[PDB]
Design a protein around this ligand. Structure first.
Ligand SMILES: *[C@@H]1O[C@H](CO)[C@@H](O[C@@H]2O[C@H](CO)[C@@H](O)[C@H](O)[C@H]2NC(C)=O)[C@H](O)[C@H]1NC(C)=O
Ligand SMILES: O=c1[nH]c2cc(C(F)(F)F)c(N3CCOCC3)cc2n(CP(=O)(O)O)c1=O
Ligand SMILES: O=c1[nH]c2cc(C(F)(F)F)c(N3CCOCC3)cc2n(CP(=O)(O)O)c1=O
Lengths: 131, 132, 49, 50, 49, 49
């Protein structure tokens, strides 16, 4: 016949941000994962026009600098030491992380809340006679 | 062969409780004429940096807008773009059309769209309510 | 009438409403995680509550 | 405020937030944002809010 | 007796307004916004039905 | 599941997540403009719903 002549996007498994699919072993590429941040990176690539690569963080850590080694770990250490390109994950924007890398504007604002159970019917008892 | 080898206006608007005038505002001068949230915020920024400032007031009363005809930003946005001011510490909404002309820091106070009601009380009288 | 009113709706409410309710009582306990920025937030807080 | 006859109900509806304005290409904007982050982590914003 | 029971049944009816869907569910109590601003631009350029 | 909890009260502090980029990167400002464009169009609230 005719013979011829001759962007790293890191995150962590968190619900509902990054969740596993059903046939995750039967898929390949970037279609194996799904969730909030997957569609977020899809919207970023739609409004910016660039190829992406959905990768998984190795240590499973968010970010911390030891007082002895002075080395950041997790996706923070991936962005500082050049192991990754951009991180799309719920990573808390702090002052100590601003000194090494940058951040965008907060798309999702939040705070500290109170988790209590739903009030079921409790037995009133002896107080029911004069309730 | 090689190369050429070489070798503060703060603007705001009168809004409560952010910027409010003092009671004896005519009896003082300088930056101490006013008070509120943003005055204390600017004093804390000057404490954490160490640069003297100057509190100015925007004249037109407009926050910031660009007309489709003139293409001219008004208010404190026009002061920052056309150099009439140096820095703005004021409750201005960080939008997409304002990021491309001037920069912004990280948001310090988040908020949202609220609902205001009449807040009804349980004004239940006595003898007038028994014959209900 | 009032006993029928209590038996009708049965809209029981939650005992805790505001953030100061944890300071107001001590019967129902409350806790945070052993490590994280939440413990630093409660530790380095300036509010007396 | 007086006469104390109103109240706020429900949660927030959108993602709104105020920040410090600075000119584009200003060299002094980054220490301003660092001071904003320091005042946020120090909780002084909550103190002025209260 | 039955009428007082009915009035006390009325007395523990529907909770006050707490969401935008509560505003959409009623039509007796009207509502408004400011005549100009990005608040009105939020509703004018909205996509949520 | 089991739909047996609930959350009450207002938020206690100002927390927020955003897109992180290394320092001195040219992509950070267009990514931030894309984030602001997604925020103003309400697509973030659509994905939240
Ligand atoms: C005179 O010109 C110089 C040169 O542009 C100005 O210095 C610049 O100031 C800006 C302020 O943010 C810096 O970002 C630049 O790096 C400076 N350039 C240099 C070469 O140092 C100076 O401000 C001008 N003097 C004025 C306007 O009074
Ligand atoms: O940068 C950080 N980002 C974090 C992000 C998350 C979330 F995104 F919600 F998963 C959480 N979780 C809170 C509850 O759900 C389980 C884990 C912790 C984070 N922590 C630890 P912190 O110090 O306690 O805030 C960080 O340090
Ligand atoms: O840039 C803007 N910044 C604004 C800042 C504020 C304040 F909170 F006082 F700082 C207010 N107010 C909140 C409601 O009561 C009246 C005053 C309105 C603003 N508007 C008008 P919008 O477009 O209707 O939001 C702007 O345009």
């Amino acid at each position: 016949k005719m013979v011829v002549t001759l962007v790293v996007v890191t995150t962590i498994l968190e619900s509902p941000y990054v969740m596993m699919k059903k046939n995750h072993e039967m898929l390949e590429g970037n279609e194996r994962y799904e969730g909030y941040c997957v569609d977020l990176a899809a919207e970023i690539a739609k409004h910016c026009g660039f190829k992406y690569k959905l990768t998984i963080v190795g240590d499973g850590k968010y970010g911390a600098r030891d007082a002895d080694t002075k080395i950041w770990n997790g996706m923070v250490g991936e962005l500082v030491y050049g192991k990754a390109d951009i991180a799309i994950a719920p990573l808390t924007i702090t002052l100590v992380r601003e000194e090494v890398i940058d951040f965008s504007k907060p798309f999702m604002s939040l705070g500290i809340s109170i988790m209590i159970k739903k009030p079921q019917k409790s037995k009133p008892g002896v107080f029911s006679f004069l309730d | 062969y090689e190369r050429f080898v070489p070798f503060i206006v703060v603007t705001t608007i009168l809004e409560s409780p952010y910027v409010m005038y003092k009671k004896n505002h005519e009896q003082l001068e300088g930056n101490e004429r006013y008070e509120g949230y943003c005055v204390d915020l600017a004093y804390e920024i000057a404490k954490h940096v160490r640069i003297k400032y100057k509190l100015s007031i925007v004249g037109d009363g407009k926050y910031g807008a660009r007309d489709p005809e003139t293409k001219i930003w008004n208010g404190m946005v026009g002061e920052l773009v056309y150099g009439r001011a140096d820095i703005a510490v004021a409750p201005l909404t960080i939008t997409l059309v304002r990021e491309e002309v001037i920069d912004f820091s990280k948001p310090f106070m988040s908020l949202g769209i609220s609902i205001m009601i009449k807040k009804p009380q349980k004004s239940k009288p006595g003898v007038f309510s028994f014959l209900d | 009438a009032n006993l029928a009113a209590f038996l009708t709706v049965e809209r029981m409410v939650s005992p805790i409403e505001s953030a100061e309710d944890l300071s107001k009582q001590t019967e129902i306990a409350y806790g945070t995680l052993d490590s994280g920025s939440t413990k630093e937030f409660f530790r380095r807080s300036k509010i007396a509550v | 405020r007086k006469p104390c006859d109103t109240m706020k109900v429900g949660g927030n509806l959108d993602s709104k937030g105020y920040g410090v304005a600075t000119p584009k290409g200003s060299a002094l904007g980054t220490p301003v944002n660092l001071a904003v982050l320091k005042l946020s982590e120090q909780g002084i914003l909550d103190k002025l809010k209260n | 007796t039955a009428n007082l029971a009915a009035f006390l049944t009325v007395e523990r009816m529907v909770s006050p307004i707490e969401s935008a869907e509560d505003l959409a569910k009623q039509t007796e109590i009207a509502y408004g916004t400011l005549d100009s601003g990005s608040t009105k631009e939020f509703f004018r350029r909205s996509k949520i039905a | 599941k089991p739909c047996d909890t609930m959350k009450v009260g207002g938020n206690l502090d100002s927390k927020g997540y955003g897109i992180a980029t290394p320092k001195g990167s040219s992509l950070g400002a267009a990514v931030n403009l894309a984030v602001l464009k997604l925020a103003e169009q309400g697509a973030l609230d659509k994905l939240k719903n």
